[PDB]
């Protein structure tokens, strides 16, 4: 990213990801600090920005990868894109499956159901493009005509309002 | 289990489920409040909000954004009633090969009465013209804010203001009027550069005709308080009375065609 | 019982075309679709359409209780089975049976018994059919005789066809009635083909097929139960409605015709498939963006695609049929040769170029009294000069130009002309020849090389495999597309699974 | 040669009306930046567009 | 004195039906266009086509010295006239022939005779054709398809019912005409060889006859050219009718030497962009959809597709439907199919009219005979039907011994 | 006036006259 901003090349970001690894070796590594310089560079990039969602994007996989949050300029999504906080397995393992004590088929049905609820209602671009975090939900083969389009309309975009100072400074 | 074809969807659960689907969802898009109010508009010789602009832009150079949008008030039971695209179209498209961007608003979803998300939409898309360096198109017609959403629409309307203001000698702005523009609606055509209007149809008025006559007595038309004709010789807002929505487009784009995309581009 | 609304369970062309014949008939019409063909022609053109599920052919209309289920709730009183899924499947005839539909077909005894290639040589031998002695055949003609049987024994041979040009023992042109027999031969062929089905028990339309040595000896190689893909032909020269027949057959009548009707000229049939052959006649998905048909005199189509259709990958290639008929079997290649030159379809590869070819072969327009085509001729002697379609892909560095077209007029003459759009007769513009949007691996997936369905798994989790060894076969349009390991090493993850369908540059699983 | 030709796509001329043809179609066929609108423009002492606009033109070539 | 490169010298359907004949014959194949034409589809499908100029038929196509022009141009070596505009043009047969082309056609003479009533009867009586003295109130048209020869050998290759007629004009015609006794065809065809032997006539023709309830033929006239409603011969009797008049135009004698027997039976429906829920009014327009019937028993020839804008200056014909059965009520069956695959958008035709008549039961007969006459349409049929709701630029060049016209569009953006 | 040029087509010589004014 810092490269592309400091050679002026628009950046496209094409987003399908569950957001961080979860683990130990993760964290021990840094993930966090990691992750906070690419949220950095995202914001500091002054180029254009357009992000295509494809399938999931959830959490700070969604954020990073070109939300309009952090500002990038031009949000599509296919309609398989998945957009949450969390993935259904997840949503479901943490608050819904831990209240009983069992792995009872009883349990094992409600959360398949509620999986089942999960993917279409919640894990759906629907919501974001109700609200608007999305610009468009397309169909695919629009994408590069669709691009084309969007550069050439943000190929003279001057960022800001940004206040000029020393540097910035970035997690390091 | 079988099914007739007038019934039957592709499944959900794949990728051509999920496709069929935004088809449908688009297509719902085309008529939010209904067919019967798109014929009842064409009836009065009218174009929609969304021929307005694709009449004005050039042939397949519009590109949506937000189309999808739904309002979120809950005040009063509008949680009952959430057309599609919350009664703005908003875009960017080209103008003889050069971009611009493009705001239109519906005047049969609430009487274009300005809210939440609607106005989110106009804001990004003024946003986007301000980044860009790009004319902006503004096509106007509602009446006043929506009540039902109370301040909301008043800090949308501020918000409004404040970025014409900011594009305010930055990028040419180009307002159309093509219904009554009625309370807030008229400060923003008031503080772009150009104004158009449609000499029967459109008005522009802050105080409508009811509360003159409360207030003063005065007994008065839309067509004598605002008409264009009046915008015209008396008060001097409008730059030009059209003819016809034709025309007024016709006129924009000559407008356009003299201007520069911005304040620091070499002029066409 | 009497026919009085039909349902037929077929995709494309003949689907099309019994929903016409019905109609001729004024019987109402019931198409089935599955989710691919919610666009296709029939589904509009049937007086209603239900729909089937699942994207594959194996659950949309292999299915069984789906097409009963559909039949019921239809209130269609008959069952088509078309040319591919279940025309031979005698169970299915049966479960119709107990249905109490009419059937529009054989009994299931005759279809199992035909189907059984050692009881069917059992019965020829009764039927004193002229058997191939033994003998392999090295360059063999391939022809076959139209039958038309009542259910009360009356049979009739509609005509001859030759389907020599062939390939996979799968036909690309064939015509009639077959050219250059003798008389005797012509006599043999149909008196055989009457013994065969009277010694089987045969009622309904059906084709019994033949191979012709280059000694012009006969032999009987199979009866196919179901008006095949060719019939046209025959209806075209004979100048009997096929389909129709059938529907009288169906409805028990005797037959109209009592005797062998006389041919008229002569017929050829072009498979219009959606295969390139300037590669190896590989069938491949995509959109018909363009379809014009040929027209006007002799000239039949029967098409199963329009402009705007979408070929996906799960269903046999075979788009349309050309027919093209003439007084003499010159005339009618006449004839074809303009209309193959009428023809064009684009957006994918078809085999139209290798028709146009063809017909202008020596080799298929024979010395007057023989010709040399044999059932191999396409796969060891045709010279194919197609070249492999690109459609409009920018390939070269000039192909990158945008270009205007334009009409000119020059004396008179009707020019046309192709302007570049910076020729010196983009300011810092460079062209270059544009990369293929092609790959160009060390990589650990298997990923599937084109969208399809996933008919076997070879491999088992935590199995370990060698460079070259097979993975999966994927089932793309009918053919068999055997994938395999790139190295060697361990299948360490394995999301497949058999009749899955998959899309292209799908993991199939990981080999470490 | 990978130039891009004129291409007759239908019919062919003879030679005198390709000459006609090709006669026909060929017949028909430094920086100032003083007061450039960016020196105009009023910028904020810390205004980022003196980087992204202002030398961005002043320096580009 | 062989025919190698045809110029056809008509637009539409005949020039599209005479293009792909000289395909099938391995002719070179020449077209020329009026300026509302040059898009039609037969200028791109011949294998060259010259411009004419001008918007109407007399500036266009009536022009002997144009189409004399064009033919110098191409360098063909033939001319034929399709049907209308000079095909019964005796002088410009003549000038055509002065020329030195092959005339794809009658002679100069028995076109002149024949086009004139008086010797037109002269030759009638003489030949001893049938021809009543009296009136007929429900006349039925009955015509036979000659081939004649320059040898004069003469085939008659069908008898053919035009008797859906509407101010003369045909509408739906049969082959072979149904419910004539074996007398009366016998008869029909006799006198048709008579008298075209006597007329002389050697190239391919139409000899039309009326037909009373009381069952008299009676002659009525010769059209002297291979008229428009010949398809439905070709495909009741197999002939290729314009392979036969190349054939005669060489001079090859008939190799038909008897009349060659009905396959069966065929109808032709004309698709006029006429509006007949309003009288059969003309009306131009854009032909924004266009989709034939196809499969099995249909024919197509058409003039027009999809995007096609025809105007007022020529005839109102768009397209021919023909439709192929064992038997007439075979042929009313998928005539009754077809006519419902046909879809025409944006201009009125007879399509809804087609659909009613092959309905009919004043059209549908008993089997014995049926009741229509050259008066149905206009006095008897219930009319159902529900009414039908930038230049290019030009340089004059002179090239060695030529002067050329050079055309191009009224913009040109070129280089 | 007319504007003459020479046109090699093929290698065959050509004159051409054309319009002095287009
Ligand atoms: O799928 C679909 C069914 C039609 C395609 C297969 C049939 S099998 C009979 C005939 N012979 C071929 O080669 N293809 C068709």
Partial sequence: IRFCDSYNLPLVFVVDTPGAMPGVAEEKGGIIKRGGRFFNAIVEADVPKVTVIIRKAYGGGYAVMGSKQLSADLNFAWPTARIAVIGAEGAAQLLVKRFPDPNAPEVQKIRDDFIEGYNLNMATPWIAAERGYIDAVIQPHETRLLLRKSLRLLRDKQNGPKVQRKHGLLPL | ?268 | SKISKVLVANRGEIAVRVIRAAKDAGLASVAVYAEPDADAPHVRLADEAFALGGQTSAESYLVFEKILDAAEKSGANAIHPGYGFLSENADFAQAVIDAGLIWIGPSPQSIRDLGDKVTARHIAARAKAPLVPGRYLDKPRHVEAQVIADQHGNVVVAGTRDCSLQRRFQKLVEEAPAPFLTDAQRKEIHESAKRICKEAGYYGAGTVEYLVGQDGLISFLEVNTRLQVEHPVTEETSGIDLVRQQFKIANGEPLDITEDPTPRGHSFEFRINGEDAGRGFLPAPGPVTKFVAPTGPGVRMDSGVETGSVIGGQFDSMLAKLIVTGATREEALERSRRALAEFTVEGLATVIPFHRAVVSDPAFIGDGEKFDVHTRWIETEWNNTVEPFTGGDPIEEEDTVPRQTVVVEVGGRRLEVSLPGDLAIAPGVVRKKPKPRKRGASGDAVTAPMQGTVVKVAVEEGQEVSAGDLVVVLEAMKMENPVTAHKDGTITGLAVEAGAAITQGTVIAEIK | DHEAHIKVLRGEPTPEEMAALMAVLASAGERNMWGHPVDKLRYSVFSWQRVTLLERTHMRR
Wanted: proline fraction near 4%.
């Fill in chain 2, 1 to 268: 289990v079988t099914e007739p074809s007038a019934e039957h969807q592709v499944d959900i659960h794949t990728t051509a489920g999920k496709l069929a689907d935004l088809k449908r969802r688009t297509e719902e898009t085309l008529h939010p409040v209904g067919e019967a109010a798109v014929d009842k508009v064409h009836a009065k010789g009218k174009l929609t909000a969304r021929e307005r602009i694709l009449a004005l832009l050039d042939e397949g150079s519009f590109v949506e954004l937000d189309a999808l949008a739904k309002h979120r008030s809950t005040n009063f039971g509008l949680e009952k009633n959430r057309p599609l695209g919350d009664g703005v179209i908003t875009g960017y498209g080209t103008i003889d090969g050069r971009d611009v961007c493009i705001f239109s608003q519906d005047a049969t979803v609430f009487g274009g009465s300005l809210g939440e998300v609607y106005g989110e939409k106009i804001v990004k898309v003024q946003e986007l013209a301000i980044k860009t360096g790009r004319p902006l198109i503004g096509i106007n017609d509602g009446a006043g804010a929506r009540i039902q959403e109370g301040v909301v629409s008043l800090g949308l309307y501020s918000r409004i203001f404040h970025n014409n203001i900011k594009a305010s000698g930055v990028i040419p702005q180009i307002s159309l009027i093509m219904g009554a523009a009625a309370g807030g609606h008229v400060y923003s055509p008031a503080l772009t550069d150009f104004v158009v209007m449609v000499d029967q149809t459109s008005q522009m008025f802050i105080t409508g005709p009811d509360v003159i006559k409360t207030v003063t007595g005065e007994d008065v038309t839309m067509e004598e308080l605002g008409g264009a004709h009046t915008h015209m010789a008396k008060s001097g807002t409008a730059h030009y009375v059209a003819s016809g929505e034709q025309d007024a487009f016709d006129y924009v784009r000559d407008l356009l065609s003299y201007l520069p995309p911005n304040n620091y581009a070499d002029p066409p």
